[PDB]
Amino acid sequence: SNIFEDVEFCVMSGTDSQPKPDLENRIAEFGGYIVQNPGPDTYCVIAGSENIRVKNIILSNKHDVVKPAWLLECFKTKSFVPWQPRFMIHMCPSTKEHFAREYDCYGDSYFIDTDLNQLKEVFSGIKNSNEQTPEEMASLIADLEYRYSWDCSPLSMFRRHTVYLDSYAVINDLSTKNEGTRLAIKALELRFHGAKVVSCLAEGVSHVIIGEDHSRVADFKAFRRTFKRKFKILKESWVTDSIDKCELQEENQYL
């Protein structure tokens, strides 16, 4: 097998499961003209460990650095698989221009479909992004669901509805929490299923959950009448009976 005919490779990574001399022996057996120091001719620079030498080559953009996994893949398939972003960590300006056309800023490419592993690797490529706020993220999520028709998913179906609860002895007072009741678990489960639990009774509230205590139903009805937008009165049983069905049951039977 002369898959490595008339090519040059330079390996400076011995910190691996297979020792570096093993890599040299395998490359020689495959026919690759190994070289102990990179030069104008060397095709690439294999390095699985980011040692001082690797950083020195990094500082000079004249040469590429390929993870050792590329050589393992070449040996396994006995074919010259082309370089991919998953293997490389630094590219000379010409190679960077070359990849910029067929690949994105990340691993994902334009002309070749994606798989689960490729998307996972692309995601691991990103570092972090925390420039948004809860309202913007919620609006973006809702817009995406509406656009791509993903509202049928088991979760995220409570996102479009804001939910208020009678967990306060007096409406619109945060100093009278009624923690220690099934209403807490109901609220928490609703929020888990994507519901937007609001602690302030704003005019934008569309859903209100009431338990076995019907004392303040009159106050809720009066507030609904006063507000320009009316929110349907609901009971804690509706969500309990709807969760098992994984769908929004009609509110006519639980008004």
């Binding site: 994902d108 334009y110 002309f111 070749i112 479909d113 994606t114 798989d115 689960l116 998307l119 996972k120 791509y148 993903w150 998913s153 088991p154 979760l155």
Partner: protein, 33 residues
């Protein structure tokens, strides 16, 4: 919770392949023309 991740990945992959076919069609048609 143990399945939401796969649920998300499926949809993300699907949208990506759809728009990937879109861009591929655009590029191929322009290059041919």
């Amino acid at each position: 919770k143990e399945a939401l991740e796969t649920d998300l990945y499926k949809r993300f992959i699907l949208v990506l392949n759809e728009k990937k076919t879109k861009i591929r069609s655009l590029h191929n048609k322009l290059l041919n023309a």
